[PDB]
Design a protein around this nucleic acid. Sequence first.
RNA 1: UUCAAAUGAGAACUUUGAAGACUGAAGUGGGGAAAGGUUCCACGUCAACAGCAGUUGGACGUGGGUUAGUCGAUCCUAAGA
RNA 2: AGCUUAUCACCCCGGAAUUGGUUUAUCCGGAGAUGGGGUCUUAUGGCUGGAAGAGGCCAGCACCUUUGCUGGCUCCGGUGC
RNA 3: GUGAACAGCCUCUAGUUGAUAGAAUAAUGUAGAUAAGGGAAGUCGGCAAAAUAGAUCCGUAACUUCGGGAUAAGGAUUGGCUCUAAGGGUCGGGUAGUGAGGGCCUUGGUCAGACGUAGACGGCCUUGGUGUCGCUUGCUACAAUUAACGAUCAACUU
RNA 4: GUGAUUUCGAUUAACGAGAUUCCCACUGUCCCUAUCUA
Lengths: 156, 50, 77, 106
Amino acid sequence: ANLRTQKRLAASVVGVGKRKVWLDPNETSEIAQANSRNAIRKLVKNGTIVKKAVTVHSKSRTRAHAQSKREGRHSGYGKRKGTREARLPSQVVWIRRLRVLRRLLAKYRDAGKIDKHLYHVLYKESKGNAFKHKRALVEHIIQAKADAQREKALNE
Amino acid sequence: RQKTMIAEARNRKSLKNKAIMPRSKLTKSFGKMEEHMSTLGHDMSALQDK
Amino acid sequence: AREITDIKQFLELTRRADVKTATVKINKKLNKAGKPFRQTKFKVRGSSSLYTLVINDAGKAKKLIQSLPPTLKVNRL
Amino acid sequence: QKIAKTFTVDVSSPTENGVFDPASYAKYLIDHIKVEGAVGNLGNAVTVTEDGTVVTVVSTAKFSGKYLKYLTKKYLKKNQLRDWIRFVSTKTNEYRLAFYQVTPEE
RNA sequence: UUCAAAUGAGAACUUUGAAGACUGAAGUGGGGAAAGGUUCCACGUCAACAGCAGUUGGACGUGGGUUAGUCGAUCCUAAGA
RNA sequence: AGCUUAUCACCCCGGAAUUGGUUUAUCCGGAGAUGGGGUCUUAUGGCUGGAAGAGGCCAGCACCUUUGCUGGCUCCGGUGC
RNA sequence: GUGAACAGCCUCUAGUUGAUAGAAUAAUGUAGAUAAGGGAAGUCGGCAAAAUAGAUCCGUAACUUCGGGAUAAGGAUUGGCUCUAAGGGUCGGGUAGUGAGGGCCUUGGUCAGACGUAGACGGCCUUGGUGUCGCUUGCUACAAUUAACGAUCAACUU
RNA sequence: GUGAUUUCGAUUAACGAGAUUCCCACUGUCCCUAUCUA
């Protein structure tokens, strides 16, 4: 027998590659009689032709290693191969930080914690890289409001 | 017995290249059944009748 | 395919001169994580467009089915 | 909140054949069901009952039919019942034990 | 690369199954332009050819197969003629 | 296919120094800023119709067969140099 | 997946297993390696091999057209594991206080719906309920100069 | 016709599959060969 055509038709009918169709070595004459896609479908239905399962590519070790990197392992100087800026762009870091600062400033200005003039001062400073992070900006705002209060009281 | 079972599973399983065929699609035999049930120590009358 | 909302427009359309066939489709759905309820779609086949009317009330759907013209040929499901 | 999801397991075919133990099945389920990461924290959250033919699991803390099938297949492998018992789902959350397709040799 | 079975007068090389490998998504994957012209598919077949072989083949014999208002051409103008 | 959906842009009210608004990137305002209310393009997304009847994944069914049938499920999210 | 990475290496989907075969394993040849002591003594000629190499921190000369030279040169470090610190988003303003508004209104009240003992939904209302809680506007009252905090959600970097 | 630029016909940083003499490091180039794999 020559079941090359039958293998091709089984691949097309089941929808998988020729590498995933199984032809029963015992039903050779029956498969050889199957010259049509309807016959191939009947053989698939009654089990003479079977679709094989995919070869497993499990991500268990990948997920384990990702969890380890989340826990903070495998992040040493012997593990780094690209430069620091190639690993993470300092421009991206700056854009994140300045957007955080502008967002907090706008929120405080809208809520009324600060006035327009203090907001303008702090906006220029955050653009000028005065504040290292959100906590630093918050504490500096608190101190500056205290200074304004004391100055107004002393001028009173 | 457990080391022998390890050897049997080793020779049967080869998954780096292809997957094991599903027992749902495959079909076994009374020869593959009654001997296993005997080594497990069970009755055979119901299976013989069926 | 067009969805029609007014029942009066649906009936005039089902009496339109070019319309010959309609279809009544039954769906089983859920209302706000509620009990499985019935949905009836009336699909009237026009020359240009298939017009669909969605009714979520079974009794109203039945009474509309009674209200349908006799000459119109209805295909159920 | 406290929705008691109930899973039923009809083992009628292997039991009436006479080569499956519902008693051992329920014992394995109680022993090996993990709740909150450990076996033996079942109380007041997961309950398992026998009825001779149908085994009921009423749980209200992270239990699924996939987990039930996993535990049942572990039990069948342990008792060497895999190659002739299959765990199938008839309706949703309603499962049963059947047998593999065995042709007649003749 | 290897084991077994089938086919066959004849099998290291055809077919199926089982294993071992490989190309490793800038592919030994899937499509086109151009070019070729039936190489596409099936059945049969091995005198010659595919630098061993051959029951295999883009080989030989015989048949079958390419369906558009919407995809292209067709229309427009470019350098140019 | 219907409804809806926007940066930009434009309109109405009002008149700004303690100048304010504001992008990652400093530009914008008496040639009318900030602010409140609007109008617009529909890239794009969403809901619905098309449409579940399709397709997919399962279970239970016959039986020499050039063969069909019956039930289920086909849901809800998250994230990012 | 690793990794700075369309690199190299391994894998999934798909595809292929084509290249004449078998038996032996001397020298030689080609390709690839190792080597005591010495270290260019070899050769026209350090030809070829070897050595160097990623990243982090420190550090860097003469000369210079001031832009460079520069990765100059020259040092330290790099695994695994358990920790510590740092880097964010969305929602949160009130009861002291008057009275109405939206919806399946627990129970209780009137009008009141076609089909196959059952009868939903639905066109109307509440001072109640989930000193009379509350989801809504109008407002006096520290509205926040401690929201300087809390509830909730998520990524991988140092 | 000359080919940057500067400075005083000379000079010149940067760069080069351009040319020459050495240095460290390195080594089977060698003393002097030997062995392993395909």
